[PDB]
Amino acid sequence: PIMLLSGHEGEVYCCKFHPNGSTLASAGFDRLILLWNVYGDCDNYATLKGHSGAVMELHYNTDGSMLFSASTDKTVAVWDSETGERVKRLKGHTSFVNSCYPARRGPQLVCTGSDDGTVKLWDIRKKAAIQTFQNTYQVLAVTFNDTSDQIISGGIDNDIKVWDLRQNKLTYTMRGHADSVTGLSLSSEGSYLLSNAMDNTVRVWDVRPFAPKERCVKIFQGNVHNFEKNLLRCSWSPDGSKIAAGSADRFVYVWDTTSRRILYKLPGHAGSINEVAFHPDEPIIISASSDKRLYMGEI
Amino acid sequence: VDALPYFDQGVREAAAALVEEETRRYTDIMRNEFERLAARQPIELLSMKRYELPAPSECVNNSMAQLEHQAVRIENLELMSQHGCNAWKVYNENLVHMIEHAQKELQKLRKHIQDLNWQRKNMQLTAGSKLREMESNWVSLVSKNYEIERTI
Amino acid sequence: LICSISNEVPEHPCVSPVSNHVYERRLIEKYIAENGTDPINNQPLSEEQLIDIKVAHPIRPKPPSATSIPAILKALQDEWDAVMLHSFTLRQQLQTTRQELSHALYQHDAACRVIARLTKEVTAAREALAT
């Protein structure tokens, strides 16, 4: 089956799948975070309330107990996935929080970026910023490597930047986007980082202790951005074999991580697509878009 | 144990020598007696070579034998000619039903033989890729570990 | 169409109900008296368990040169020649299969020792590159 989900009154910007594949989380412009049953009759249970701005990005921690939510109200909330109670508010950035990531494995860490041009490292136990990286241009997307040593940030400067937690220096610069980067994501192996950008280029970059030194490992095409200037996010399949990235042309694009052939171009959406997610066990795709509906495609 | 036949397109004489070097290191009665003796010796037991030759002027018996068998012969050729070719071509039809059944089994075996090989082919191509993936990653470490040490 | 014992084309075929296979009555009747079980499947089978089958009968055209004379002399001689020299040659074929069996299993076990010897060799050579 396909399965069509509806309920969000406004644009859906992000959706994720619980690490154990039992539930979905979704949120957008409404300001509500909805939880869904992946199986059964695809029912909706708890609604998380308390964000005053729109929800720009959701993530689960690796355990699926904590759900992180960057909002436009400058606050990043930490949510209990079990009860739906709010845990903490990371008040800190002076402007909109565009995105956030939670470090897997290591002691609890959270990274954020915002329109104030800074990137901040948070320890959820301190109620204060740990480190600050002033960039100079607004920051749109940010992710940790698997070792929790490096911060990867994508902004409007067309240059993905890598930060060293110990040195606090600009370690790496990646050139190869011609325009703003709207969405970043690490492979489950730590091996590769996936990027979307206005230039309509999906680029994979490889991050390793020993690097070729010009890490434009692969380039994919199909994915269109337009006058809506929506943030666009991309995801890796659980096994790193497939790449999905949303577009503004109503199609979900899925590519073969090797041959780079388009495996799927999927319709059903009426408007622009903001995020595509893969179920952690089975070939199921959750596609979230601005038309306020979700699809559960099965491959 | 594992040796991919379909995938390995690229030694038999070499491997034969190595296998050769490990090898350098390591109910019937009387019937059966006369039958095995006849086959071993390569000699068939002689029959009655008497009835055909004989001679005019013991031979009174041999003569009277030739008559009764000749009358039985001429009666044995009468009942054959009465039916004639109808009895022969009726058996010829049976032989065509017997033949076609064998070649149907030739096909059934042909299909299941190619069907088993067809399943093997996919397995060979599945793993041969996975082995290719492993070797690429193997060579990457091999040089990665070096380039780490060179800089240190 | 044939019998599953002698390799005949049966005159009175009979089928067993434990294993669907047609035998000629005389040859299946002999097996049950020798040891009361089905020859192919080795399942319990008796003479009453058998079921006679019917067909349009089999026809052999007795040759044009058919008399008591060739049938006694030439034809019967050839039949006991053909029985004798075949089973002797078949006993020769069974003897070589057992000899060629021994050359197969020895060469197989010879290869097993090469693999076991090379399994210790390869991974330790790869390990030495790691070290």
Place this chain on the structure above:
Amino acid sequence: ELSHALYQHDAACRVIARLTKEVTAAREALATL
């Protein structure tokens, strides 16, 4: 038994051909290093 052996013998024989060439590659690699 004859057929299954001869097939599996020459099949197991190809294990050696593969194994020998890899073993050989490990030698010059380590030797030259």
Place this chain on the structure above:
Amino acid sequence: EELKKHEDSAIPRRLECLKEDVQRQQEREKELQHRYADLLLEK
């Protein structure tokens, strides 16, 4: 028929060996970086 049954088992053993062979190679890669990473600490 026989070639299928004996082969199908040999491949998991072929792969599982190379899988564990790969795991060890990853460890040497995983440490050699850290010594390079510690070059920046002394600076």
